[PDB]
Design a binder for these strands. Structure first.
Ligand SMILES: Cc1cn([C@H]2C[C@H](O)[C@@H](COP(=O)(O)OP(=O)(O)OP(=O)(O)O)O2)c(=O)[nH]c1=O
Ligand SMILES: [Mg+2]
Length: 641
DNA sequence: CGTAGC
DNA sequence: AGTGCTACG
């Protein structure tokens, strides 16, 4: 059955285990965590969860043999210092040591190994959860129990009476079930190693291991570095914005109260509907629940009466002040090592299109520069609150219409290629065509609306929805759709070809080989069929974009790893020259990367990005990247030197 | 389900 | 329930 080897029990056993580990090229280390049971005696305390303490590691390189490694203060001959030195020695790559480390929940394992244990891995990684995601990107988040059931049933009974295996975290990370940390870590390590062998066989069968080891797992490593770094958050430039928007809120409240003649609650939709549609006789739309008070109907009614405009403005600003201001202010970590407050989001890569999202909180869902003025515009935005460390500047690198360039690549539209190769800025052109104005006369919000429209036709938009958004009639929207389709016939050819491919093969192929499965295209419902077709088109295009940005991330990390021989990330800095210097990667926005570059390497690192993002993949269309730098994310300015 | 980003 | 990836409330 289960065979746990207590390595730290005998000196000879420890030495032969170390020799075998050094002679091994594929291991499955893991972590063990227990309760305090009341620091520096049970193990290294885990950052964040002060009630949890690390205990041991579990390494399994085949079969059911789990070699448990103890970092406890207790074999008295083997002290903690030389044991730590040995563990660091066998967990580092050197002299072409092509070792693969299989860790479940690699980001969290890397973080705990760095901050508390003080050791950072440098070998190839083979996270089994990532491979399970690669198999079925649209599937639910893979817990240990799910991957064990779906990829290792014979050894599945090893989890009998183990309710902790169903949690999101690894078996050896949770502070739950009564099982000891050592045994839990050992059984989890055996299970993940065997399941990862099965997953590697499956990926080799599917021809997906290259995209799993060359870009995907290095992208997980980059995301671990991003989680270690965090985003520099300053409350000096956030509290002021919060107070300004609260002042605007109360001003709008008083104005609406004096206009309507009475005080009413804005949050309640029924009261707003009664006040606006009934009392003020505003024209109701076709479609409790007496009237609909959605954003689009309020926007349509903005011109007719001033009050709906104030209501809509109050709703946004309160959405900014509750869904954004509160999550950011609630979780900010003040660390003296960087000398300023930061925020550490949790990077989730299990999205259905290969995109990278952030949970607790969602940083990318921060309101942009929207200007509102009260008794000229203030340009209120919380993006300015993301001030980097002192002596450093945020260096974003926005892809210049990556989605359109990629679509032109797999569509081979001569007109699209020739309009993207130049600095035409097709979004400005379509905005100028729509508004019958000069391209330079367009604004930021107008250009954003134009780009939303253009991507709407690009991914497939109904005539009615395009009419409601564009403010034009349904027939005019249909004629606009037809003109857009006829102008770019290659886009239609690519869309039809990829829809046919999704219907035939049952899935779609990203340009780096990753696949997403859409059974819904075979659904008899016309809604489901059309939704799955548009889902397939956007899935291939957006997965290509996300894989391009992930290749850019891993290439930039490699380039600033070879250069700038300093501490790799703030997590490595706190794992324990003095000046902060590096190209730390702090945020991804689904099309761009934020780098908290130091004030001395602003230009050179930027150039590196402008290389690696440009030559990430040799496409049919040159991938323009605008590198912007600034003292904050809010007011970053373009840099073309 | 409505709304914010991409 | 007819632009899609999300995340939060
Ligand atoms: C606004 C918008 C973006 N997107 C997607 C398309 C791409 O995946 C991504 C674009 O990210 P942006 O970085 O927002 O778009 P861009 O690269 O096209 O251009 P700009 O330099 O003007 O900022 O977001 C939509 O699908 N629909 C929309 O309405
Ligand atoms: Mg962008």
């Amino acid at each position: 059955s289960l065979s746990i080897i207590d390595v730290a029990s005998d000196q000879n056993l420890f030495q032969t285990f170390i020799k075998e580990w050094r002679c091994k090229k594929r291991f499955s280390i893991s972590l063990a965590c227990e309760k305090i049971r009341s620091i520096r005696d049970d193990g290294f305390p885990i950052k964040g969860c002060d009630d949890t303490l690390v205990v041991g590691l579990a390494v399994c390189w085949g079969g059911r043999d789990a070699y448990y490694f103890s970092l406890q203060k207790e074999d008295p001959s083997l002290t903690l210092k030389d044991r730590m030195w040995y563990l660091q020695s066998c967990l580092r790559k050197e002299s072409d040591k092509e070792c693969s480390v299989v860790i479940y929940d690699f980001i969290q394992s890397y973080k705990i190994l760095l901050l508390s244990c003080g050791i950072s891995l440098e070998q190839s990684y083979e996270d089994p959860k990532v491979a399970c995601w690669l198999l079925d990107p649209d599937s639910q988040e893979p817990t240990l129990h799910s991957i064990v059931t779906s990829f290792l049933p014979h050894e599945l009974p090893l989890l009998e009476g183990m309710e902790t295996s169903q949690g999101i975290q690894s078996l050896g990370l949770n502070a739950g079930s009564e099982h000891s940390g050592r045994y839990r870590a050992s059984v989890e390590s055996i299970l993940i190693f065997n399941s990862m062998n099965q997953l590697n066989s499956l990926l080799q069968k599917e021809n997906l291991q290259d995209v799993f080891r060359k870009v995907e797992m290095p992208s997980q490593y980059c995301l671990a570095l991003l989680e270690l770094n965090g985003i520099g958050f300053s409350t000096a430039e956030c509290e002021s914005q919060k107070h300004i928007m609260q002042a605007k809120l109360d001003a709008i409240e008083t104005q609406a109260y004096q206009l309507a003649g009475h005080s009413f609650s804005f949050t309640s939709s029924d009261d707003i509907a009664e006040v606006l549609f009934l009392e003020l006789k505003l024209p109701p739309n076709r479609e409790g629940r007496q009237f609909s008070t959605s954003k689009d109907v309020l926007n349509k009614l903005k011109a007719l009466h001033p009050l709906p405009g104030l209501i809509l403005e109050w709703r946004r600003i309160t959405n900014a002040i509750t869904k954004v201001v509160f999550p950011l202010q609630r979780e900010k970590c003040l660390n003296p090592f960087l000398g300023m407050e930061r925020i550490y989001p949790v990077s989730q890569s299990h999205t259905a299109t290969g995109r990278i999202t952030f949970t607790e909180p969602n940083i990318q869902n921060v309101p942009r520069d929207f200007e509102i003025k009260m008794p000229m515009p203030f340009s209120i935005s919380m993006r300015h609150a993301f001030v980097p460390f002192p002596g450093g500047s945020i260096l974003a690198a926005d892809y210049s219409q990556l989605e359109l360039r990629i679509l032109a690549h797999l569509s081979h539209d001569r007109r699209l290629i020739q309009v993207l190769n130049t600095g035409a800025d097709v979004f400005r052109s379509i905005a100028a065509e729509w508004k019958m104005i000069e391209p330079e006369s367009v604004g930021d919000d107008l250009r954003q609306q134009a780009k939303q429209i253009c991507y709407g036709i690009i991914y497939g938009m109904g005539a009615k929805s395009l009419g409601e958004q564009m403010g034009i009639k349904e027939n005019d929207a249909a004629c606009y759709i037809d003109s857009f389709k006829s102008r770019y016939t290659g886009i239609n050819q690519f869309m039809t070809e990829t829809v046919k491919n999704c219907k035939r093969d049952g899935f779609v192929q990203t340009i780096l080989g990753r696949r997403r499965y859409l059974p819904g295209i075979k659904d008899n419902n016309p809604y489901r069929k059309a939704h799955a077709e548009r889902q397939a088109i956007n899935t291939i295009v957006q997965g290509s974009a996300a894989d391009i940005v992930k290749i850019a991330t891993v290439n930039i990390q490699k380039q600033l790893e070879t250069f700038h021989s300093t501490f790799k990330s703030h997590g490595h800095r706190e794992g324990m020259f003095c000046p902060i210097r590096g190209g730390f990667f702090i945020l991804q926005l689904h099309d761009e990367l934020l780098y908290e570059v130091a004030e001395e390497d602003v230009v050179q690192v930027a150039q590196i990005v402008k290389n690696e993002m440009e030559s990430a993949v040799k496409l049919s269309v040159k991938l323009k990247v605008k590198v912007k730098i600034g003292a904050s994310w809010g007011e970053l300015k373009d840099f073309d030197v």
